[PDB]
C-alpha cells in the first residue's frame, strides 16, 4: 500500500468554541490530547456534564438523560498505518424507553 502525498480539505475544521456545548439542554465539556505520532495531531473528546437534562431556568430534570453521541474516526499513525479511534463528539437529551406496564 502506497500513501499518496497530499490531503484533501486539510484546511476545513470545526470550531469547538461555538458554546453550542453550553447552550444545549444536554451540555458537555471538552478534553484535548496532543500526539505527533498521528494525524490529526489533536483529538477532542466530549464528556456529558450532567446525567439529566437542563431547561431554560437552569433546573435539572432527571426523568430524561444526557447521553453521548459517538463516532468512529480514522487517524493515521507512524511507515504509516491507519488507526480507528472512538470519539465522543457531544451529548443529546433522551427520554428512556418506558414500556406500557409502568
Amino acid at each position, epitope marked *: 500500500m502506497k500513501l499518496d502525498i497530499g490531503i484533501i480539505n486539510e484546511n476545513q475544521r470545526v470550531s469547538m468554541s461555538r458554546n453550542i456545548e453550553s447552550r444545549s439542554t444536554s451540555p458537555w*465539556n471538552y*478534553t484535548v490530547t496532543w500526539d505527533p505520532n498521528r494525524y490529526p495531531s489533536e483529538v477532542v*473528546q*466530549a*464528556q*456529558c*456534564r*450532567n*446525567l*439529566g437534562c437542563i431547561n431554560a431556568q437552569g433546573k435539572e430534570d*432527571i*426523568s*430524561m*438523560n444526557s*447521553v*453521548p453521541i*459517538q463516532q468512529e474516526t480514522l487517524v493515521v499513525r507512524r511507515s504509516f498505518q491507519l488507526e480507528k479511534v*472512538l470519539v*465522543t463528539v457531544g451529548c443529546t437529551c*433522551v427520554t*428512556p*424507553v*418506558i*414500556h406500557h*406496564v*409502568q
Partner: antibody, heavy 125, light 108 residues
Framework: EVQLVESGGGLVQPGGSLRLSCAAS????????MAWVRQAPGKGLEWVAT????????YYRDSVKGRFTISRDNAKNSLYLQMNSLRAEDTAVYYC??????????????????WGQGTLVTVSS | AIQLTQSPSSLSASVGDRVTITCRAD??????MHWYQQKPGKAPKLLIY???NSEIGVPDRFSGSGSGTDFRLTISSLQPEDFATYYC?????????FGQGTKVEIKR
C-alpha cells in the same frame, strides 16, 4: 484501553490487616471517583467504598466503617483499600471499579463502566 | 437503603428465545438504574446505563427499559455465550445497591 490491575489479596487471620492496590491506566485517573466492590463466594455484588478524584471525601458501607480506609495516590495512578480488624464476613473477591470515560467525573452518581480482575481475600484462622 | 429485587432468580431459555429479567426497587430511583453481566470467574461487565443506554461494545440484542420502581433487561435472541448472572444496580441513594442476581442458563 481502561485497565485496572489489582493486587495484594490472600490469606489473613481474623483481626489482621491487608492492603489492596489497584493500578489504573488508560484514563485520567486523577479526574474520576474510584470505588471498591466486593463479592463473597457464591453470593452477589456489594458496594464497599468510594473516594473522590481529589481525595477529599470517603464514603463507606456501614459494615466496614471504622475498619476499612480507602486511599489514592493520584500520582502513581493507584487506588488502595486498607482493611483492619478483619472478620469472616469480609471473605470475598474485591473488585476495583472506575466510572465512564465519556461523562464528567464531578458527577457523583456515576456507574461502574470498568472493573479490575479482582483479588480473593480469605479471612480464616 | 433502596433494596432491589430481580425476578426471576434463575431461568432457562432456548437459543433464540426472548428473555426478560425485571428489577424492582423499594423507592423510585428515577432513571438511575444500571445493569451488569458477570460470567463465571470473571468480573462484571457493564451492559446498560441509565435504564436503556448501552456501552460501545454491547450486542444489539440487549436492551433496557423501565421507570421509577420497575425496570427490565431484555435479551431479544438468547445466544450460547449469554450464559451468565445479570445484576441491576441503582445509584440514586447513597448506599449503592445491587439486585440479588438472575442466573441465565441455556436450554438445549
Amino acid at each position: 484501553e481502561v485497565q485496572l490491575v489489582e493486587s495484594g489479596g490472600g490469606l489473613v487471620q481474623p483481626g489482621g490487616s491487608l492492603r489492596l492496590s489497584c493500578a489504573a491506566s488508560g484514563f485520567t485517573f486523577s479526574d474520576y471517583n474510584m470505588a471498591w466492590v466486593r463479592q463473597a463466594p457464591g453470593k452477589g455484588l456489594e458496594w464497599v467504598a468510594t473516594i473522590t478524584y481529589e481525595g477529599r471525601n470517603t464514603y463507606y458501607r456501614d459494615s466496614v466503617k471504622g475498619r476499612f480506609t480507602i486511599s489514592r495516590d493520584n500520582a502513581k495512578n493507584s487506588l488502595y483499600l486498607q482493611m483492619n480488624s478483619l472478620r469472616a464476613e469480609d471473605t470475598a473477591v474485591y473488585y476495583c471499579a472506575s466510572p465512564p470515560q465519556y461523562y464528567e467525573g464531578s458527577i457523583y452518581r456515576l456507574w461502574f463502566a470498568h472493573w479490575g480482575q479482582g483479588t480473593l481475600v480469605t479471612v480464616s484462622s | 437503603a433502596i433494596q432491589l429485587t430481580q425476578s426471576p432468580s434463575s431461568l432457562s431459555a432456548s437459543v433464540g428465545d426472548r428473555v426478560t429479567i425485571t428489577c424492582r426497587a423499594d423507592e423510585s430511583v428515577r432513571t438511575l438504574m444500571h445493569w451488569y453481566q458477570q460470567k463465571p470467574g470473571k468480573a462484571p461487565k457493564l451492559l446498560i446505563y441509565l435504564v436503556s443506554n448501552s456501552e460501545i461494545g454491547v450486542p444489539d440484542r440487549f436492551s433496557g427499559s423501565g421507570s421509577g420502581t420497575d425496570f427490565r433487561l431484555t435479551i431479544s435472541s438468547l445466544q450460547p455465550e449469554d450464559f451468565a448472572t445479570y445484576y441491576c444496580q441503582q445509584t440514586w441513594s447513597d448506599p449503592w445497591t445491587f439486585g440479588q442476581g438472575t442466573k441465565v442458563e441455556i436450554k438445549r
